[PDB]
Design a protein that fits this description.
Oligomer: part of a larger assembly
Bound molecules: magnesium ion
Pfam family, one (chain C): Ribosomal_S19e
InterPro entries (chain C): Ribosomal_eS19, WH-like_DNA-bd_sf, WH_DNA-bd_sf
Strand content of chain F: under 5%
Keywords (chain C): Ribonucleoprotein, Ribosomal protein
GO cellular component, one term (chain C): cytosolic small ribosomal subunit
GO biological process, one term (chain C): ribosomal small subunit assembly
Order of helices and strands of chain C: HHHEEHEEH
Strand content of chain C: 5-15%
Shape of chain C: globular
Strand order of the largest sheet of chain C: 1-2
Chains: A mainly alpha, B mainly beta, C mainly alpha, D alpha+beta, E alpha+beta, F mainly alpha, G alpha+beta
Chain lengths: 70, 61, 142, 103, 69, 199, 138
Amino acid sequence: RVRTKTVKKSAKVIIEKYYPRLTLDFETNKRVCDEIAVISSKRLRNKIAGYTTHLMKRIQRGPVRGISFK
Amino acid sequence: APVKFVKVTRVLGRTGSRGGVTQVRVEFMDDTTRSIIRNVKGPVRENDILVLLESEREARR
Amino acid sequence: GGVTVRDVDAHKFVAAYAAFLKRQGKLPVPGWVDTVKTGNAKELPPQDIDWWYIRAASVARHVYLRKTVGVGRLRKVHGSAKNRGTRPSHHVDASGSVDRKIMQALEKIQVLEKDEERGGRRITQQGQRDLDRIAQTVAEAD
Amino acid sequence: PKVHKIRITLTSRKVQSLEKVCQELIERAKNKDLRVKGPVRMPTKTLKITTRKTPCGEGSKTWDAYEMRIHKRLIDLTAPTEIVKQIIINIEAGVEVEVTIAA
Amino acid sequence: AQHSVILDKATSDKLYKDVQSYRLVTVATLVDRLKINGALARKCLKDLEEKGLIRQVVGHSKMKIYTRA
Amino acid sequence: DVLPKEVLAEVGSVKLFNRWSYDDIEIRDISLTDYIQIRAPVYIPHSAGRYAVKRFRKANCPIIERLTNSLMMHGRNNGKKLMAVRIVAHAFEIIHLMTDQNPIQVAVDAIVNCGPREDSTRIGSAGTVRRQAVDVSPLRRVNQAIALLTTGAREAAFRNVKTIAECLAEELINAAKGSSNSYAIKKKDELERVAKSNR
Amino acid sequence: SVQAVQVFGKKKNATAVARCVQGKGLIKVNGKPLKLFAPEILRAKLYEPILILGTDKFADVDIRIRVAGGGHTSQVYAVRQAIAKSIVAYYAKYVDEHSKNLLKQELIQFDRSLLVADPRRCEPKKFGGRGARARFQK
RNA sequence: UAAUUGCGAUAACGAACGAGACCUUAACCUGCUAAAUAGCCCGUAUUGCCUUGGCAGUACGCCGGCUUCUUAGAGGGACUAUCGGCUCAAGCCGAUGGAAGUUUGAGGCAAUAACAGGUCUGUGAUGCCCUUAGAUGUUCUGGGCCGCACGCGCGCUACACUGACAGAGCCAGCGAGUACUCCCUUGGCCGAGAGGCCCGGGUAAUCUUGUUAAACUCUGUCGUGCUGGGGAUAGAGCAUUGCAAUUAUUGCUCUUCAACGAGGAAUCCCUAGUAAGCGCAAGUCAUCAGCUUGCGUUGAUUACGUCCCUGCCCUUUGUACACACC
Ligand SMILES: [Mg+2]
Ligand SMILES: [Mg+2]
Ligand SMILES: [Mg+2]
Ligand SMILES: [Mg+2]
Ligand SMILES: [Mg+2]
Ligand SMILES: [Mg+2]
Ligand SMILES: [Mg+2]
Ligand SMILES: [Mg+2]
Ligand SMILES: [Mg+2]
Ligand SMILES: [Mg+2]
Ligand SMILES: [Mg+2]
Ligand SMILES: [Mg+2]
Ligand SMILES: [Mg+2]
């Protein structure tokens, strides 16, 4: 169960472009992603939402290299 | 024969030419100080209890 | 309370109905007994001597539960596997004459009648109430 | 003007094209104040053919399974005879239609 | 190996003085020590059943077992 | 009313088998518990379980189920579990009349006694065997005990006037004590003897 | 009006639809009572939802069940599932669920499969089930 | 990590195929849109039994009500989410919840470079060579491809009591079907049996069809004897298909009653509704399945690993090999 570059690369750009609009909740982040992105698969959308909510959990305690937002 | 009872505390890899044998660290469950190394043929979990016919053989490595 | 066919065990009910027809003692027999195979798949005649009478009791029992039945349907209901030798077995149906005449003779006993409106044979007004009466012979026999 | 209780049957291989035909057809009759009965869902009939891949018989033995699916979605209505002619016009490719007065 | 299909006085007496001590009586037991055929064993099984000397534990189309009274 | 009068006798008391209760279990040894499961009673053994998905999931399963499944083998008896349940029930009645103890009382002691405690492992020696006489885990001990008991009954009843109903029954009472004339005991002592030599 | 609820249980290919109607404590399947519809040894697997719960909790309930499809032992597993689902669904709608939650917790603690189905079907393959044909010289 | 899948280190930076994504299918929805070619409740008429007020069936309703079960559309649903323990990170192990937690299960498609792989007997795809009116063209009669001291491979039926035989009980799923001539076939009568005759339904969720299949379950007979286990071999008779049945096309009745007691050296397949057991449908088809492609019923033992054998992928290293350890 390892996420490929398409999932990881797309998660990086979403966080920095729209940081405050989406939060630690997985359910809310699911509805944030499909409005501000063009995804052709429901399963692909689910995986993207799963990774981005994981990234902010560790963001809450100290910043992480490779991530920059305003 | 003075048969002894031992209990498993840790599992240490799988040995043997074909992986059939497994190596475990046992506990004598009557004198808690002593501890040795043995080999077992079947599936083993932690806190399992084994019966030893002789308690002086030990095992390689 | 009242009981019916569904309220009694099938094995003892058909055996009980075989006993009643002994006392009534009126069922036509066309001389086929002791010679027929009762089916192409088989090799030996039935062991029990009064097999013509036990079969009729069971045949009338399921028609009580089914809306329309003919000789063709009963031919394959009583069929079974056949030992073709060293080849794999299959399914073949029972004899036609045995099942046809066991219910043709059952017509004149006033148990079930024809259904020319759509086909097959159905149970009659007084025919069904007769098999209901023998149910109490078994239920309170307990 | 005598009602005849018509019934219309449809057949096609596509699934999306057929569905929107019924969606507009039911609306074409509903706005005209006609009592319409629902679009029943007949079973899909799938038929398949299996054949060996190789044309000579050499090598390993491998087969493939072709497929084909058909849907019906038949519809019926209560209306006079002449009015129904103008209600089934302007149909697209793929869907086949059969008319039955069912008098 | 072969057993006896007929029951004589030499075998009849064996039943009524020994079955009072058996814990189980089955088709196999009669063929084992009484040296009698299985068909006779079943025949011997049912006739003594109504005589009131053994009681049925379980009845089945495959095996039957009886014990003391 | 809705239930037969037979089952009304047991409904008042604690739940149990057709005839026998799982109370008063043996106090004889250790290291064999946690792998024979009797804490959850079952009316009939038959059950469509999920015991073949993980490693030790089948350890939590009634022993009668374990015994019943192993009874049907050798081609003809595949999937015929209904026949197996009948054999076990009838065999349990046979042992009850020859011994006042519970039929499960006999069955449990039969398993715990016919399990080998040492075995020789195959380590290559370029055509020779360096049998090291390794120990045996508790899970394998109960698994191999079941196989020995069932294959003995299957061997005896083959081409014999006896039926498997009591051939299985007579082994369990034999295996309850050190009878040494049973198939399981003959093989168990033989396996332990060869292991001692290769020490 | 009359109090009734419909539940169903499934197996591989055995569907058992049931309707529980406020009655007097009568249970019959396919018309016949519980005395008949099962193999003799398999009749035990029908009574468990009663003994674990008690006959006193079936005081005024009537159940009629129709089942078709599948096999002999598959069908008996479906009907025993409908009995458990019927009693818990009727209790939720018409009486306090303090029984229902106590009914549900106790029923699944003995066996979880009584209320939930097991998903199992077959796999098609081009060699048989899962094994291939014999090889000549490997 | 299932993966050149990622975390990262970096004389490299940025990209293109393959993997993944994706498509079909199997599991969930008492929520939406619905349905007499799919059902239920209800209401009439009507039957039996207790009689109660009941219980079990029948026939009808076409705007009486409804969609749990059946059916196919639009969408929802799993992401490893939450919790605990390792780690800087990517990730891994266990538990709870849940229809579902191996990539959820099983498939389809599938890169660069190659082989003197197979096919001229699939093709009115094709070069060259050959014969072309005593034809290698085409067509009609007859025969052969099946001929049997012997060796080898893919299968079928068995060596029985966990069985055979006799009566009764009684449960599936995927599919197929009528022409310029009858294709699946209900019902009725005759017939030991296989079959025969007369009305009739269905171009098909409408009729055959609930395809009430087999194993299996209950009650009996036989009793360890190659015997009622086993059905090879062979005689006679009665039938169907076709223009034609001998070297028997196949089917039915009576009689004949072989070898074969769990199989040597060797050797193949397989991890959950899976192995094995058993049957059904389709393909070829006037008739003939012991074969193949699919479907359901019953339903386990054992591992959750290692590189010892037979092989595969990456790196360091040696070479007198390059047709490359044959
Ligand atoms: Mg076979
Ligand atoms: Mg296949
Ligand atoms: Mg299979
Ligand atoms: Mg095969
Ligand atoms: Mg996949
Ligand atoms: Mg040839
Ligand atoms: Mg006509
Ligand atoms: Mg119909
Ligand atoms: Mg013979
Ligand atoms: Mg065919
Ligand atoms: Mg062929
Ligand atoms: Mg060198
Ligand atoms: Mg070099």
